[PDB]
Amino acid sequence: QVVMTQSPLSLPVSLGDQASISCRSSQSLLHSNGNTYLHWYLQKPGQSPKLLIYKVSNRFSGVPDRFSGSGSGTDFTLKISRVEAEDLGVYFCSQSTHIPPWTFGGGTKLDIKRADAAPTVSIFPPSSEQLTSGGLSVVCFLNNFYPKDINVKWKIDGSERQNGVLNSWTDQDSKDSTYSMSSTLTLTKDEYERHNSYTCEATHKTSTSPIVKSFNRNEC
Amino acid sequence: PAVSVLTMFRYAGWLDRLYMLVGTLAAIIHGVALPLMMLIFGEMTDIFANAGNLEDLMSNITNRSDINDTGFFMNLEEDMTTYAYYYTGIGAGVLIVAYIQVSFWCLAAGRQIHKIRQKFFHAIMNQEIGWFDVHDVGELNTRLTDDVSKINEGIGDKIGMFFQAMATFFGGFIIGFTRGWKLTLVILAISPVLGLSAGIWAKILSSFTDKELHAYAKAGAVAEEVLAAIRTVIAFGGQKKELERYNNNLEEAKRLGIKKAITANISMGAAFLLIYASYALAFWYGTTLVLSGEYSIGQVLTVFFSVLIGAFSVGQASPNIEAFANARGAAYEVFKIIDNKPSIDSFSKSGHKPDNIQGNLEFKNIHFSYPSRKEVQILKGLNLKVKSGQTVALVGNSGCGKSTTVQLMQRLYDPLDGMVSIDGQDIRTINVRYLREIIGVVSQEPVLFATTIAENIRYGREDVTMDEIEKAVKEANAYDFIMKLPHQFDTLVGERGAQLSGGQKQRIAIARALVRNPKILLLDQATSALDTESEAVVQAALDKAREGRTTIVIAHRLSTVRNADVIAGFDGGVIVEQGNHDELMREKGIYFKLVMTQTPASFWRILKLNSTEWPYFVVGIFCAIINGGLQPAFSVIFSKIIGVFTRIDDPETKRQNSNLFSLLFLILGIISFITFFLQGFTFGKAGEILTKRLRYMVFKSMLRQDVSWFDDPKNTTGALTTRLANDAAQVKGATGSRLAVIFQNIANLGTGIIISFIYGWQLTLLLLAIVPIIAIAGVVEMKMLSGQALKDKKELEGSGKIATEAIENFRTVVSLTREQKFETMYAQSLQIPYRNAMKKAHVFGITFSFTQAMMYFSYAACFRFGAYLVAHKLMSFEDVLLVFSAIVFGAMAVGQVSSFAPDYAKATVSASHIIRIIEKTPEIDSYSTQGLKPNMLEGNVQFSGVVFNYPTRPSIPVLQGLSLEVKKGQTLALVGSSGCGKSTVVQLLERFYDPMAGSVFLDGKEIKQLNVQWLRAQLGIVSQEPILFDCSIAENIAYGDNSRVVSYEEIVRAAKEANIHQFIDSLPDKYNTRVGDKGTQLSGGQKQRIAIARALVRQPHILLLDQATSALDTESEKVVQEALDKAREGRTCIVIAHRLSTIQNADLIVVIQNGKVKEHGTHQQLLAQKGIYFSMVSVQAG
Amino acid sequence: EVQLQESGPELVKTGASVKISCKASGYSFSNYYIHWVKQSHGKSLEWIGFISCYNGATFYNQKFKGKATFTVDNSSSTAYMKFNSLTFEDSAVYYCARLPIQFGNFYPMDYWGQGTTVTVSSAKTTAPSVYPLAPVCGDTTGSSVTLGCLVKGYFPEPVTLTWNSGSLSSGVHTFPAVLQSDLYTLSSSVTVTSSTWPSQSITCNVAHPASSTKVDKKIEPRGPT
Ligand SMILES: O[C@@H](COc1cccc2ncccc12)CN1CCN([C@@H]2c3ccccc3[C@@H]3[C@H](c4ccccc42)C3(F)F)CC1
Ligand SMILES: O[C@@H](COc1cccc2ncccc12)CN1CCN([C@@H]2c3ccccc3[C@@H]3[C@H](c4ccccc42)C3(F)F)CC1
Ligand SMILES: CC(C)CCC[C@@H](C)[C@H]1CC[C@H]2[C@@H]3CC=C4C[C@@H](O)CC[C@]4(C)[C@H]3CC[C@]12C
Ligand SMILES: CC(C)CCC[C@@H](C)[C@H]1CC[C@H]2[C@@H]3CC=C4C[C@@H](O)CC[C@]4(C)[C@H]3CC[C@]12C
Ligand SMILES: CC(C)CCC[C@@H](C)[C@H]1CC[C@H]2[C@@H]3CC=C4C[C@@H](O)CC[C@]4(C)[C@H]3CC[C@]12C
Ligand SMILES: CC(C)CCC[C@@H](C)[C@H]1CC[C@H]2[C@@H]3CC=C4C[C@@H](O)CC[C@]4(C)[C@H]3CC[C@]12C
Ligand SMILES: CC(C)CCC[C@@H](C)[C@H]1CC[C@H]2[C@@H]3CC=C4C[C@@H](O)CC[C@]4(C)[C@H]3CC[C@]12C
Ligand SMILES: CC(C)CCC[C@@H](C)[C@H]1CC[C@H]2[C@@H]3CC=C4C[C@@H](O)CC[C@]4(C)[C@H]3CC[C@]12C
Ligand SMILES: CC(C)CCC[C@@H](C)[C@H]1CC[C@H]2[C@@H]3CC=C4C[C@@H](O)CC[C@]4(C)[C@H]3CC[C@]12C
Ligand SMILES: *[C@@H]1O[C@H](CO)[C@@H](O)[C@H](O)[C@H]1NC(C)=O
């Protein structure tokens, strides 16, 4: 096992310039031959992973000439040149030349590089049908923010809670190129009738103070 | 001139057609064993190749158990065993299929030949004598022998092998198109040049054992000319011109042998160039494709090997259609003779059967001509009658009508017009067997069969008892000499038995005619060359036989014409004179003219014979070790180019290693071509130089030695022309070719066994235990390709001489109608080697099958033990493929090399014969220049008590103390009787022998101490029959004095003293008129005058005249006596004679008996003393 | 053209075994290996094992020995793994890819199958519970108002949620379904103008075609409750 570590987790690439991905090994991939094996695959969403760069310097027959490899030892690099809209997938780097664990890399998505923006946080109260059935489910929407760096946090009456919670982020828009997400707190009925101050925390990189939203239960 | 395909098999029954129909299917099923063997080999190399990749991936996991490297490899070990059963299946199912392939064609075409041979002889014997007059006899005998041998080889085994080669071709292309097709189309693009080169090499291979007597035959005619008459060559000093005449044509034969050797070895070398260049192309494209991940290595090996053996099988299927192409032409010559129907049909039995036959007859207007000599009609309009007992004789012109009616009586010919009728009954409506049963005849010259006495009487009738035979031989006046016989009637008599006299065979032939009990007895000239002391008793015997038969005697000794009843005379083919004796006396016609006129090997010595051409042998063996060492180079390159694929590597390392190894294939191909060409050329030149030089040296040392060496029957013209024609080209195959064989095989197997003990030894002990059987497989397959049928034909000679013995004297057999005895004599002598040939076919089929079966079981055992030995990691797969390829393909290569060269045992016995001929030296050395060499010109020859016996037999002392002195200038003659050897001292004057006691005193000097070339320089000889050459008459006449500067004018002078000069001027191209079988043929008197002119070119001091009788011209006697009388004046002559017209002008005639002069003196003295000369004049005066 | 393509997506229960196939088509099938790999939800691709694809000699990973077994079929040119002893952890997306055999380990996996997913379940079909979500009673100050409706507790995927059956496409942020307690949960929302709601009628139309359930809840403002 060479514990490979491809170490951008995302890459905010624009449309029409250069991109650069790492691929960092954990033991040097120089065989007794004078050759270094690690290959580079593009995986589109849904389809089959294709081959683009193999045997770090070479180039597979069929791929265009926008791609280029580099590096040796324990640090490697692919270089997109003047990226189009067609190269937006996830890129990873087999292999181990010390087989048979045959490790693979982590992956690196791409982006469309929007300007920065702020979320529009909204909390919705628990529904009356959920008040009839016997549970609490409070939902926080927050939409149209860039980039994907957020950590929502739930706090009830000034007291924290990190149990019984969900999170679901949508993917990249193709019309405005932004993100949105949701969190839902889920517990029983009788927990809901003990508190009033239900708060949320919007820890975004585009502000110092978190955007707090709240509502109080006992009035309506 | 050839027959259709459905006619050659017309003499086959149904068992023969069943044998051929099973042999064809066995040929096709044997055809597709080798492509299927290559298919299973490709599938096995694919199995071994796939397992190896997995070995290394596993190898890097260190904790892996031994049972792990068992499971992948266990699977490999288990799969191998099923393919071992596949190989044993193909081997044990090609054993019985090759046995049915060979044995069911030699049988089914030995049976047809054994039918056609006896049916052909029976068709020959049932032919007309008129048809037999046109055709030759030697042409017909050679037609029988060689034509039936060609029909035997044409359908014998060649067609089954043709079907096998075509089936291997079709199986190879079917496997090549259904396993993988792109590589098959690539190799099929170069298929036609591959098949063309293989066809040329196969034509070279099948025509290997061929003597090629067409280059030598000019010198062969020279040798069979000169060695047929050697006594003349020594006498006239003909040495240097004869050797030059031999030497030029021998140089031409050397040049033709040079060009044949260079062409044959470039035709072999181009095939191996194409083999290795095809290997390089197919592996370059095959590893362009297997590195693209399309085929595997199994499919590349399979389609490559199968398409290659397909192209080479249509290569080798060409001479097996050549032999069927010319057997179609030979069968026309046999079938046309066995197709014809005779018009008389002496075997047919349909005519009448008369009884109480007495011999009445009527010639009725017969008009007859020969069908051979068509342009002249000999007999016309004849009318002669006879009654019972009337002994008619006829005398007249020479040879015209004296024999035609004695032949027409047996119905040897039909009359073109007219109708002879016996007893008022037609001669052509009697059964011809019965017609020739009642008429006996005695021939002019009787020929006698080489059998016993009693068996020669048995040909008269096959129902006779020995009492009748004994009373007949006592009855025919023959018992006196035959009761002096060694044991009994089983006495061997013939030309190989007791050489009898003509009168004895004559009277036993009339005795055979008496055992026939004839009714119309015929006699034609029973006293051709018989002595007067025997003609009386044979005339007495035939006069005892004359009582009671219608006798016709036509002979010489015109005295029993008086006792004869009615005489007749020939006049232009119409006989018009008829009457008795005194009536013909008063007719005063031709009969008056008749009564007016008459009344240790030591192989280092065989190489020591070639100690001048070692700059050819050095480059020859240095080239042969290189050429016989590139089979292990092919093994190592094949093993590495396959073992590059049972290992894991990069794509580019695999690509460049495959490119390197294909390049090494092409380089090995060019090097193998160059080394085959030079090993061919240098040993070819160093063989032909020894053939030319050894033929010239054996001819010089054979011409030189004495006359007594030529007297033994083991030194004949035939035996010496064989040991001069056939033996230089069989000493050429024991000096160079043996060294080439030993050095090629020692490189080809020493390198293989040394590197195969280096790499893996536990396999090579097993393969070295198998190797002798597959080497023997190579040698017996190479025996099958050319030389199988050639041996058998030399064994059949018991019926080889019966047919030629009974076809020469065909007239004696047709007179006797005893053809059925000769046919059964042929039949049983043919019945024994037929059974011997069937046993040899049942041996050859099973040995040729078992060698192939061992050739496939070698694959089976080797790869099973190789898989076990691989699956414990102590040999790789490439090393098992190397060990197998070396120690199998090297064994097949040493088989083919050791059989491709000529034999050694026949070569070393031929070398011992030549080395024991060329170094022996006689006592009378004809090249000794030492001696006195005097200046003598008178020539007083003085004999004193010469005692001589021949070395061929010491049982008869022939000379007992002969003293004889010749005076200068006189013509001292010598005449004697039969058996006395009149020419012994005549030959002894030239020192053709040397007598034991006594000496010759040539002016007081012995011939022992002279110089022999001086003696031959002043001596001229006249022979009985002249010896004529294939040159001009200017050099045939100028032959009389060799080692001289003789010019045109002395030839003109010797033509003046010849009386052939204006006869030469009557001929066009006067001196240039070449004589021989390519020129004109002369009479006895003209060739005699040629001999006298030739001897008188020399102008010698002493002449020697040696003459014999039986000339037929008898008008040139006066002119040869006038040339002799031109020579009897100043040249001392020695004369023997048979015509006694020289006994008056001969000077000192001598009676010779008991090796002693009876009396000295002249003619009237020795005639008045009433000695033996009185007896010869009293015999020839009556 | 070289093309490997695979089976359909599974929806298997816990404990059963599943067979998934990779039908290699467009090349000479009897040389190349077939490598089976596994990708979890948002993790690195692990490697399970390969088959010899000529004689069926297999080699597994260390972690996956026993709870996988491969088999070939040379006639149909496919490859299978019959994945016994299922847990919850074996829900992933599984790929097949080929490696050449003459120069394996020194060549990349040049063509990959499209990959199809295995989903381990433990429950049965359950109806959804479509609740609407209102703006908060109290403050209503912004000129843009957000409307959402929650769908909780259903099984199994998918659910086609659409506001007004397809007449509203102005900010429908439909979110992926979330697994909890082996029961899925979806949510959705839209931002409309302040003058539209509640002056106009708007609603979503949840359809669950796996259980033929079609619910149409109209949202209501929170008044006294
Ligand atoms: O021995 C049999 C059986 O064949 C095999 C069977 C099983 C295994 C074998 N393994 C290796 C080799 C042959 C194997 C094959 N004869 C071997 C001998 N051929 C002979 C021959 C003779 C002298 C020198 C070279 C050759 C070779 C081919 C050839 C071409 C035209 C005419 C004749 C031949 C050639 F000129 F190129 C005929 C086929
Ligand atoms: O021994 C070798 C080399 O022969 C010699 C070497 C050195 C000296 C020699 N001197 C005289 C004669 C031959 C000599 C000959 N075998 C003869 C038998 N082959 C057979 C064979 C059989 C039938 C038809 C064609 C062939 C030819 C080659 C081949 C390829 C694969 C498998 C078998 C064979 C082929 F398909 F193209 C192998 C080589
Ligand atoms: C005992 C004797 C009489 C039996 C002879 C056995 C031989 C003729 C049999 C046994 C095994 C058979 C082989 C079985 C399988 C194959 C593979 C197939 O795709 C082509 C034919 C081929 C190669 C067969 C050829 C014929 C074969 C070799
Ligand atoms: C008798 C000889 C001189 C005729 C010429 C034959 C040879 C030289 C020619 C004929 C057909 C040719 C082949 C045809 C097809 C190709 C495909 C190409 O991508 C690789 C080379 C290759 C394999 C060629 C190699 C050369 C070739 C084999
Ligand atoms: C006459 C028949 C056999 C055709 C012979 C074709 C031979 C002479 C030619 C045709 C194509 C040639 C090959 C073309 C390319 C190269 C690459 C080089 O780096 C090694 C030699 C090699 C591999 C050649 C070997 C010789 C070759 C195979
Ligand atoms: C390592 C050592 C043992 C290898 C020696 C090779 C020897 C055993 C083999 C290789 C080729 C063989 C020769 C092949 C041909 C013949 C011709 C035959 O008419 C006499 C034997 C003879 C001459 C063989 C003698 C033994 C021989 C020379
Ligand atoms: C390592 C030692 C045992 C190797 C000895 C090799 C011996 C056993 C074998 C190998 C090759 C064999 C020879 C191969 C071929 C022939 C040609 C044949 O016409 C005569 C026998 C002869 C000459 C064989 C004699 C025995 C032989 C020489
Ligand atoms: C007299 C000696 C040379 C035997 C002659 C026949 C030999 C060559 C043949 C006939 C039967 C064949 C055997 C048939 C069966 C098998 C079983 C397999 O598991 C190993 C190979 C083996 C054993 C074969 C080896 C070769 C073999 C033994
Ligand atoms: C010439 C005679 C005396 C021997 C010929 C047979 C030899 C050559 C061959 C035929 C088949 C071969 C055997 C094939 C099968 C096996 C079984 C394996 O587990 C051990 C090796 C062994 C036993 C091989 C040994 C050698 C062998 C027996
Ligand atoms: C593998 O490792 C264990 C202990 O670490 C040891 O018992 C075992 O023998 C090893 N297997 C081999 C083949 O060495």
PDB file of C-alpha atoms in Angstrom, chain B residues 49 215 319 347 360 429 443 547 586 595 734 784 828 889 912 916 928 942 1009 1017 1020 1022 1067 1091:
ATOM      1  CA  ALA B  49       2.416 -18.467 -21.491  1.00  0.00           C
ATOM      2  CA  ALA B 215      28.307 -35.744 -69.757  1.00  0.00           C
ATOM      3  CA  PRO B 319       7.756 -34.777 -58.612  1.00  0.00           C
ATOM      4  CA  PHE B 347      -1.692 -69.548 -80.516  1.00  0.00           C
ATOM      5  CA  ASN B 360       1.913 -84.031-101.407  1.00  0.00           C
ATOM      6  CA  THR B 429      -6.872 -73.450 -93.191  1.00  0.00           C
ATOM      7  CA  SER B 443      18.560 -74.406 -89.767  1.00  0.00           C
ATOM      8  CA  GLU B 547      13.688 -92.839 -95.998  1.00  0.00           C
ATOM      9  CA  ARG B 586      22.194 -82.519-121.271  1.00  0.00           C
ATOM     10  CA  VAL B 595      30.187 -78.608-112.981  1.00  0.00           C
ATOM     11  CA  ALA B 734      34.674 -40.606 -49.707  1.00  0.00           C
ATOM     12  CA  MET B 784      11.627 -43.031 -48.939  1.00  0.00           C
ATOM     13  CA  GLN B 828       7.750 -69.321 -62.133  1.00  0.00           C
ATOM     14  CA  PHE B 889      15.342 -30.612 -34.305  1.00  0.00           C
ATOM     15  CA  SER B 912      40.319 -49.943 -52.812  1.00  0.00           C
ATOM     16  CA  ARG B 916      44.940 -51.585 -56.327  1.00  0.00           C
ATOM     17  CA  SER B 928      60.824 -47.954 -70.141  1.00  0.00           C
ATOM     18  CA  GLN B 942      66.504 -66.127 -85.106  1.00  0.00           C
ATOM     19  CA  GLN B1009      67.295 -56.704 -73.098  1.00  0.00           C
ATOM     20  CA  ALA B1017      59.572 -48.129 -84.044  1.00  0.00           C
ATOM     21  CA  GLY B1020      54.678 -53.099 -88.823  1.00  0.00           C
ATOM     22  CA  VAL B1022      48.842 -56.689 -90.307  1.00  0.00           C
ATOM     23  CA  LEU B1067      34.244 -40.594-103.098  1.00  0.00           C
ATOM     24  CA  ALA B1091      44.629 -52.435 -93.061  1.00  0.00           C
TER      25      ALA B1091
END
